Amino acid sequence: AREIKSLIEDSVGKVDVGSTLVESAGETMAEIVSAVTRVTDIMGEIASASDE
């Protein structure tokens, strides 16, 4: 029983560390979704400006 408890504590640790990596992956999406979206708007300005 105590042996399994050590595995749960170690397993929960990987979840906490794994969650940080998962949450960190979500933060990058906020930058990618915000950077690529802004870049997409720049193309509209350059494309619209190029038409002028």
């Binding site: 399994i4 408890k5 749960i8 504590e9 397993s11 929960v12 979840v15 906490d16 794994g18 969650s19 998962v22 949450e23 992956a25 979500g26 999406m29 906020a30 990618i32 979704v33 690529v36 979206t37 870049v39 997409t40 193309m43 509209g44 350059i46 494309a47 190029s50 038409d51």
Partner: protein
């Protein structure tokens, strides 16, 4: 010569917008999947807590 570059610059702008816009769709879809994994860690952590 300037008119020829206008089409190229304007073409690359629209082509880049398609890839940029498409790159944002896959990014938003990836974020939703990351959000689902966030709730999974809470379930694993909550489930692991019950086992403890």
């Amino acid at each position: 010569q300037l008119t020829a570059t206008v089409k190229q610059n304007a073409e690359n702008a629209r082509q880049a917008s398609h890839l940029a816009l498409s790159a944002s769709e896959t990014a938003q879809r990836g974020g939703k999947v990351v959000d689902n994994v966030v709730q999974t860690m809470r379930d694993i952590s909550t489930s692991s807590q019950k086992i403890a």
